Amino acid sequence: AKVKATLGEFDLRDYRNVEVLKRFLSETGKILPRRRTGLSAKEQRILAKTIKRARILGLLPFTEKLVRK
Amino acid sequence: GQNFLIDTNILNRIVDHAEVTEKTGVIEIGPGIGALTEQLAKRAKKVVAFEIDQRLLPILKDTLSPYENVTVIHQDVLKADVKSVIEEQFQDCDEIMVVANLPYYVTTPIIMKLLEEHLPLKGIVVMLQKEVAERMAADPSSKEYGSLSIAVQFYTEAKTVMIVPKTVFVPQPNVDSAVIRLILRDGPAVDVENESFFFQLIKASFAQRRKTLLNNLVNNLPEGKAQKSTIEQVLEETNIDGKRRGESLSIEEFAALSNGLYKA
Amino acid sequence: KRQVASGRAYIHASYNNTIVTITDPDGNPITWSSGGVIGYKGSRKGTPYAAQLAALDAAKKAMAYGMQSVDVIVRGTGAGREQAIRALQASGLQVKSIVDDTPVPHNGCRPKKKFRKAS
Amino acid sequence: ARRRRAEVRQLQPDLVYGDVLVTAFINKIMRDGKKNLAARIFYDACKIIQEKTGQEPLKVFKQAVENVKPRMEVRSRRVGGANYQVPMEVSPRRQQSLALRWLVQAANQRPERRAAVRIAHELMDAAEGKGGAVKKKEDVERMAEANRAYAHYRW
RNA sequence: GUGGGAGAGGGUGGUGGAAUUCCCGGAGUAGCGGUGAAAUGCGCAGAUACCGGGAGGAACGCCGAUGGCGAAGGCAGCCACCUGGUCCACCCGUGACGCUGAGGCGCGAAAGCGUGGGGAGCAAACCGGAUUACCCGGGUAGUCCACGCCCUAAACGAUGCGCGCUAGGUCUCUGGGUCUCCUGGGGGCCGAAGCUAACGCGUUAAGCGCGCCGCCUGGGGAGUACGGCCGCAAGGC
């Protein structure tokens, strides 16, 4: 199930819509590929830009630790 | 077993190049299989074989029945003193030669250290690679020039006696083999204050070859590391040496430079 | 000696060796164990069996300090991560969570000759 | 074999006891096709067992056999030009094969002059829990899982 | 011209985190590290695991693409400024104002070099170890910046540029419209006609044509010799 599917209506250039932004990051603080997100490249590119910008703001994690062996 | 030469023709030619006669004496380094030893002993007054290989010696030793001049000494030439050999085994023939067809990674340091050992012998003829042969026998302003040529310039004037095809060697080396001759000079080619200091200078000059003489001597020299602030007078002490390199200069130039260095 | 009653066990699982260190929440290392202290040398230092023995040894020598529960984070990509973790959890200390915290560069320093040629 | 899986020969059970393992021991004693001699020597050994030990000799035989059946063995392995005595599980077939072979080999090592004496003494000693066969079994077992590091090579 | 679009195109300042290496502490016991297996090496002056604080340099993990930009060489964190190229739509202005281009001028990966800075990591040369009678431990220039040289490559699509005509199918990037689809531009894979010695190319031609430029005339000798020009030199034409 693509991450896009389990979502409604939002804006991508909004680098403060933090709650939706946690969705597009994996179990680790990594940006999910197009296979998981379910967007077009343009959307993926702009989303990655926004994600990095938010990371700079400290609203999002650069990296995390995964609860698994 | 390394690449072993199997040609009687080129072996005859090389042993001729060695001038192995009745008067001529032979030092054998790494007798090995015993083809070179075969071609040497029959025309040599006394052959002294040095080797440290475990079993390459006593097997060959069996074949040494017809030869009466085969005084094989089992030891490492580098580790073991050779001074005593001159007195003990050259009573038959005062003339000295060193002949080798060994691998070069052992041969070249052996030759260097033998020359360092300061044993006065007439000459040496060894088998080496084409590139290193060019490196030793080199002229000024050459890509094949370096510190090795400078080192061998004190001891001998060299020339590759006979270029060797790769075919003669069992496994074939990719690069052509070229046998050189090293016949010891009467004495030092050019005088110097200190030999060790001269060597340090030549190392410093050719450390970073491409850079200018000045840039080499600034950073390469340890005493240069001490007198980095003082290199001004070092520039002053230079005579008719402008913006220059190492390769540009010759033996006499470097000798005069060293003699000037002592006066700093 | 300390009796924190709740610490954390670090598992440094390299290729050549596995290291297990148990420590308090304050990061103060109470003790440690490795494949080397068991007596294994050379190649067999990083074997999964060595990882098992190291985990058990660390657990045993930690029980003396009264440790009962730990929260483990594993480091390195060595062959014996799974073996070490299973041995540790089956030693007598109730692990709360199992986590990895393997350090990965963000294309920083230039690596060794062998580890180069990254896709 | 490359193709098949070499179906196991079903030994005809002995007539005295109606047991296949007795036949296996008989065959293992056998040399130069002397079936009669092996049978007679085994039955002699059974006479010693009966005379010295109360219960039926077949019980002693089975007790000793299951006493010697190993569980871990090493197989020389070729990984990176080095020999590894990789511990491996042994199948029941191989278990019984090794047990019978070890029992017979150990029984001969005894200094006693007669064969039946040797067989009976070794077998009863193995039933006790000691002797040569049990020693060899223990040696084999401890040699395995002494280097269980290499056991990651599953084969 | 007007109205929009995408982009690691370039230059200048600013600063975000993860590593790596050192320094300062707290705790910590005997190894750490390394290999096909080992040795060198580090560690009782308490190493390696690990917690915290600080310094410094270099490079930007996922996104990431068989993707995009540029005339090539090349260009990946993020922010802002100054700029280069390009696509579509409206058909609004001009009236042939165009194509190519000997010399000239400029740009030109990496490695070298001069004059000054910087140096975390890697690492020519070099110091060690060892075995298969390459590989592991250290380390200099160099890789980093400013200015000035050098002008070389499998600098390759081994395919010069511009324009026109000649079946389609499929996957992508980016626009526009009336939006199952039409219509442009860019990047791949099959394949009509055709071409080729063959492999193969095929609307991004190696097809059918036109214009201009640059080269080829058997293999070595030889990119050598002499002469000339350009560089501090190595060297380049």
PDB file of C-alpha atoms (C1' of nucleotides) in Angstrom, chain E residues 68-212:
ATOM      1  C1'   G E  68      17.996  15.950 -15.720  1.00  0.00           C
ATOM      2  C1'   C E  69      21.350  20.271 -17.413  1.00  0.00           C
ATOM      3  C1'   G E  70      25.545  21.838 -20.728  1.00  0.00           C
ATOM      4  C1'   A E  71      28.960  23.084 -26.958  1.00  0.00           C
ATOM      5  C1'   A E  72      32.448  19.792 -25.031  1.00  0.00           C
ATOM      6  C1'   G E  73      35.624  18.815 -20.413  1.00  0.00           C
ATOM      7  C1'   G E  74      31.862  18.099 -16.714  1.00  0.00           C
ATOM      8  C1'   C E  75      27.800  19.268 -13.006  1.00  0.00           C
ATOM      9  C1'   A E  76      24.629  16.157  -6.769  1.00  0.00           C
ATOM     10  C1'   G E  77      23.388  18.778   1.158  1.00  0.00           C
ATOM     11  C1'   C E  78      20.600  23.331   1.984  1.00  0.00           C
ATOM     12  C1'   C E  79      19.745  28.971   1.667  1.00  0.00           C
ATOM     13  C1'   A E  80      20.028  33.694  -0.843  1.00  0.00           C
ATOM     14  C1'   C E  81      22.063  37.043  -4.834  1.00  0.00           C
ATOM     15  C1'   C E  82      24.260  37.855 -10.027  1.00  0.00           C
ATOM     16  C1'   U E  83      23.938  35.314 -14.575  1.00  0.00           C
ATOM     17  C1'   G E  84      24.167  31.409 -19.400  1.00  0.00           C
ATOM     18  C1'   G E  85      21.348  28.076 -22.406  1.00  0.00           C
ATOM     19  C1'   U E  86      16.500  26.004 -23.710  1.00  0.00           C
ATOM     20  C1'   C E  87      10.914  24.356 -24.471  1.00  0.00           C
ATOM     21  C1'   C E  88       5.579  25.488 -25.219  1.00  0.00           C
ATOM     22  C1'   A E  89       1.460  28.954 -26.222  1.00  0.00           C
ATOM     23  C1'   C E  90      -0.424  33.649 -28.565  1.00  0.00           C
ATOM     24  C1'   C E  91       0.733  34.168 -34.175  1.00  0.00           C
ATOM     25  C1'   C E  92       1.731  40.038 -32.109  1.00  0.00           C
ATOM     26  C1'   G E  93       6.326  42.909 -34.881  1.00  0.00           C
ATOM     27  C1'   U E  94      11.058  42.780 -39.130  1.00  0.00           C
ATOM     28  C1'   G E  95      11.166  41.211 -44.304  1.00  0.00           C
ATOM     29  C1'   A E  96      16.150  36.694 -46.132  1.00  0.00           C
ATOM     30  C1'   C E  97      18.566  39.973 -41.614  1.00  0.00           C
ATOM     31  C1'   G E  98      20.729  32.629 -43.219  1.00  0.00           C
ATOM     32  C1'   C E  99      24.480  27.947 -43.218  1.00  0.00           C
ATOM     33  C1'   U E 100      29.444  26.610 -42.755  1.00  0.00           C
ATOM     34  C1'   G E 101      33.942  28.354 -41.504  1.00  0.00           C
ATOM     35  C1'   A E 102      41.304  28.382 -43.304  1.00  0.00           C
ATOM     36  C1'   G E 103      43.875  31.520 -39.518  1.00  0.00           C
ATOM     37  C1'   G E 104      42.572  34.406 -34.748  1.00  0.00           C
ATOM     38  C1'   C E 105      40.314  34.427 -29.775  1.00  0.00           C
ATOM     39  C1'   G E 106      38.311  31.574 -25.631  1.00  0.00           C
ATOM     40  C1'   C E 107      37.109  27.017 -22.746  1.00  0.00           C
ATOM     41  C1'   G E 108      39.322  22.461 -21.765  1.00  0.00           C
ATOM     42  C1'   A E 109      38.826  15.628 -16.901  1.00  0.00           C
ATOM     43  C1'   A E 110      42.792  13.700 -14.405  1.00  0.00           C
ATOM     44  C1'   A E 111      48.186  14.129 -13.408  1.00  0.00           C
ATOM     45  C1'   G E 112      52.235  17.659 -13.232  1.00  0.00           C
ATOM     46  C1'   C E 113      54.492  23.107 -12.015  1.00  0.00           C
ATOM     47  C1'   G E 114      55.560  28.496  -9.941  1.00  0.00           C
ATOM     48  C1'   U E 115      54.028  31.740  -5.731  1.00  0.00           C
ATOM     49  C1'   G E 116      51.310  31.645  -0.946  1.00  0.00           C
ATOM     50  C1'   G E 117      47.748  29.084   2.397  1.00  0.00           C
ATOM     51  C1'   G E 118      45.545  24.261   4.322  1.00  0.00           C
ATOM     52  C1'   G E 119      46.113  19.069   5.485  1.00  0.00           C
ATOM     53  C1'   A E 120      40.754  15.066   8.618  1.00  0.00           C
ATOM     54  C1'   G E 121      40.768  10.646   5.414  1.00  0.00           C
ATOM     55  C1'   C E 122      43.104   8.192   1.226  1.00  0.00           C
ATOM     56  C1'   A E 123      47.628   7.624  -0.924  1.00  0.00           C
ATOM     57  C1'   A E 124      52.795   7.755  -5.984  1.00  0.00           C
ATOM     58  C1'   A E 125      57.701   7.441  -4.100  1.00  0.00           C
ATOM     59  C1'   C E 126      59.373   5.395   0.568  1.00  0.00           C
ATOM     60  C1'   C E 127      59.810   2.277   5.924  1.00  0.00           C
ATOM     61  C1'   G E 128      58.072  -2.194   7.272  1.00  0.00           C
ATOM     62  C1'   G E 129      56.022  -7.165   7.581  1.00  0.00           C
ATOM     63  C1'   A E 130      54.636 -11.749   5.627  1.00  0.00           C
ATOM     64  C1'   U E 131      52.998 -15.930   2.823  1.00  0.00           C
ATOM     65  C1'   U E 132      51.102 -18.824  -3.306  1.00  0.00           C
ATOM     66  C1'   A E 133      58.114 -21.031  -2.196  1.00  0.00           C
ATOM     67  C1'   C E 134      49.686  -9.834  -5.176  1.00  0.00           C
ATOM     68  C1'   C E 135      48.170  -8.741   0.309  1.00  0.00           C
ATOM     69  C1'   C E 136      48.167  -6.189   5.667  1.00  0.00           C
ATOM     70  C1'   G E 137      50.571  -2.342   9.009  1.00  0.00           C
ATOM     71  C1'   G E 138      52.717   3.078   8.577  1.00  0.00           C
ATOM     72  C1'   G E 139      53.857   7.346   5.514  1.00  0.00           C
ATOM     73  C1'   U E 140      55.935  11.914   1.846  1.00  0.00           C
ATOM     74  C1'   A E 141      54.600  14.835  -2.280  1.00  0.00           C
ATOM     75  C1'   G E 142      49.555  14.870  -4.187  1.00  0.00           C
ATOM     76  C1'   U E 143      44.358  14.949  -3.635  1.00  0.00           C
ATOM     77  C1'   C E 144      41.612  20.855  -0.642  1.00  0.00           C
ATOM     78  C1'   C E 145      41.736  26.950  -1.618  1.00  0.00           C
ATOM     79  C1'   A E 146      43.506  31.984  -4.239  1.00  0.00           C
ATOM     80  C1'   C E 147      46.265  33.750  -8.421  1.00  0.00           C
ATOM     81  C1'   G E 148      49.314  32.245 -12.763  1.00  0.00           C
ATOM     82  C1'   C E 149      51.100  28.122 -16.101  1.00  0.00           C
ATOM     83  C1'   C E 150      50.538  23.259 -18.475  1.00  0.00           C
ATOM     84  C1'   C E 151      46.547  22.076 -23.117  1.00  0.00           C
ATOM     85  C1'   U E 152      46.868  15.931 -22.788  1.00  0.00           C
ATOM     86  C1'   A E 153      43.430  11.217 -23.301  1.00  0.00           C
ATOM     87  C1'   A E 154      39.544   4.820 -25.081  1.00  0.00           C
ATOM     88  C1'   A E 155      38.866  14.094 -24.704  1.00  0.00           C
ATOM     89  C1'   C E 156      34.152   7.766 -27.653  1.00  0.00           C
ATOM     90  C1'   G E 157      28.320   7.729 -29.987  1.00  0.00           C
ATOM     91  C1'   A E 158      35.563   5.446 -31.851  1.00  0.00           C
ATOM     92  C1'   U E 159      29.859   8.604 -35.993  1.00  0.00           C
ATOM     93  C1'   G E 160      31.611  17.433 -37.958  1.00  0.00           C
ATOM     94  C1'   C E 161      27.754  21.104 -38.501  1.00  0.00           C
ATOM     95  C1'   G E 162      22.875  22.984 -40.735  1.00  0.00           C
ATOM     96  C1'   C E 163      18.388  21.995 -43.477  1.00  0.00           C
ATOM     97  C1'   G E 164      14.605  18.939 -46.197  1.00  0.00           C
ATOM     98  C1'   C E 165      12.053  13.849 -47.411  1.00  0.00           C
ATOM     99  C1'   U E 166      11.313   8.317 -46.091  1.00  0.00           C
ATOM    100  C1'   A E 167       6.143   2.713 -42.047  1.00  0.00           C
ATOM    101  C1'   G E 168       5.371   2.103 -37.414  1.00  0.00           C
ATOM    102  C1'   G E 169       5.320  -0.240 -32.142  1.00  0.00           C
ATOM    103  C1'   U E 170       6.834   0.445 -26.959  1.00  0.00           C
ATOM    104  C1'   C E 171       9.054   2.913 -22.203  1.00  0.00           C
ATOM    105  C1'   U E 172      10.303   7.426 -20.107  1.00  0.00           C
ATOM    106  C1'   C E 173      11.301  13.440 -18.862  1.00  0.00           C
ATOM    107  C1'   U E 174       8.932  18.059 -19.765  1.00  0.00           C
ATOM    108  C1'   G E 175       5.001  21.591 -21.795  1.00  0.00           C
ATOM    109  C1'   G E 176      -0.056  22.995 -24.352  1.00  0.00           C
ATOM    110  C1'   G E 177      -5.238  21.735 -25.678  1.00  0.00           C
ATOM    111  C1'   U E 178     -11.407  20.719 -26.168  1.00  0.00           C
ATOM    112  C1'   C E 179      -7.579  15.720 -21.545  1.00  0.00           C
ATOM    113  C1'   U E 180      -9.972   7.119 -23.284  1.00  0.00           C
ATOM    114  C1'   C E 181      -6.818  11.023 -26.745  1.00  0.00           C
ATOM    115  C1'   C E 182      -4.401  15.038 -30.047  1.00  0.00           C
ATOM    116  C1'   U E 183      -0.111  18.215 -30.424  1.00  0.00           C
ATOM    117  C1'   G E 184       5.469  19.993 -29.567  1.00  0.00           C
ATOM    118  C1'   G E 185      10.576  19.289 -27.637  1.00  0.00           C
ATOM    119  C1'   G E 186      14.497  15.544 -25.094  1.00  0.00           C
ATOM    120  C1'   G E 187      16.239  10.687 -23.773  1.00  0.00           C
ATOM    121  C1'   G E 188      16.229   4.849 -24.543  1.00  0.00           C
ATOM    122  C1'   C E 189      14.555  -0.389 -26.869  1.00  0.00           C
ATOM    123  C1'   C E 190      12.458  -3.301 -31.192  1.00  0.00           C
ATOM    124  C1'   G E 191      11.790  -2.880 -36.131  1.00  0.00           C
ATOM    125  C1'   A E 192       9.133  -0.955 -42.967  1.00  0.00           C
ATOM    126  C1'   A E 193      11.715   0.666 -47.159  1.00  0.00           C
ATOM    127  C1'   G E 194      16.615   1.416 -47.697  1.00  0.00           C
ATOM    128  C1'   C E 195      22.093   0.934 -46.693  1.00  0.00           C
ATOM    129  C1'   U E 196      26.529  -2.098 -45.345  1.00  0.00           C
ATOM    130  C1'   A E 197      32.277  -6.773 -46.398  1.00  0.00           C
ATOM    131  C1'   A E 198      29.694  -8.235 -42.266  1.00  0.00           C
ATOM    132  C1'   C E 199      28.531  -6.881 -37.405  1.00  0.00           C
ATOM    133  C1'   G E 200      24.740  -3.809 -37.591  1.00  0.00           C
ATOM    134  C1'   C E 201      22.173   1.471 -38.566  1.00  0.00           C
ATOM    135  C1'   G E 202      17.270   2.600 -39.260  1.00  0.00           C
ATOM    136  C1'   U E 203      12.430   9.990 -38.123  1.00  0.00           C
ATOM    137  C1'   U E 204      18.373  10.967 -31.982  1.00  0.00           C
ATOM    138  C1'   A E 205      20.275   7.016 -39.747  1.00  0.00           C
ATOM    139  C1'   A E 206      25.564   4.365 -40.638  1.00  0.00           C
ATOM    140  C1'   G E 207      18.802   5.710 -45.578  1.00  0.00           C
ATOM    141  C1'   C E 208      17.677   9.423 -49.858  1.00  0.00           C
ATOM    142  C1'   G E 209      19.826  14.673 -51.129  1.00  0.00           C
ATOM    143  C1'   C E 210      22.219  19.709 -50.885  1.00  0.00           C
ATOM    144  C1'   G E 211      26.135  23.501 -48.904  1.00  0.00           C
ATOM    145  C1'   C E 212      30.711  24.291 -46.120  1.00  0.00           C
TER     146        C E 212
END
